[PDB]
């Protein structure tokens, strides 16, 4: 758990279902979305 300061980070297992992650990130945290944009890059150092 815990905040990050120099945001909110979380270590979580891969085998969890996405519905309780959505319930975490929308109920305990900020609101819903009209849109969701994804970007793929990160193999480029």
XYZ file of C-alpha atoms in Angstrom:
45
model
C 0.000 0.000 0.000
C 0.939 3.612 0.562
C 1.422 6.918 -1.211
C 4.568 7.884 -3.098
C 6.267 11.292 -2.861
C 9.670 12.502 -4.021
C 0.930 9.360 -6.372
C -0.493 6.038 -5.186
C 1.304 2.770 -5.935
C 0.276 -0.840 -5.389
C 1.981 -4.205 -5.695
C -0.610 -6.767 -6.753
C -0.627 -10.318 -8.088
C -1.261 -11.077 -11.756
C -3.989 -13.658 -11.076
C -6.509 -11.195 -9.636
C -9.678 -10.357 -11.531
C -10.113 -6.883 -12.968
C -13.545 -6.264 -11.433
C -12.340 -5.810 -7.851
C -9.492 -3.670 -9.201
C -12.105 -1.481 -10.893
C -14.105 -1.391 -7.641
C -10.953 -0.312 -5.782
C -9.961 2.335 -8.301
C -13.470 3.809 -8.644
C -15.056 3.445 -5.189
C -12.111 4.235 -2.907
C -10.502 6.457 -5.571
C -11.561 8.862 -8.365
C -14.571 8.694 -10.678
C -15.460 6.954 -13.950
C -14.559 7.646 -17.596
C -16.143 8.738 -20.868
C -12.954 7.610 -22.632
C -9.869 5.474 -22.068
C -6.699 5.964 -24.114
C -3.879 3.410 -23.977
C -0.341 3.902 -25.258
C 2.202 1.160 -25.965
C 5.905 2.151 -25.691
C 8.474 1.020 -23.131
C 10.775 -1.370 -24.869
C 12.480 1.792 -26.133
C 15.042 2.799 -23.517
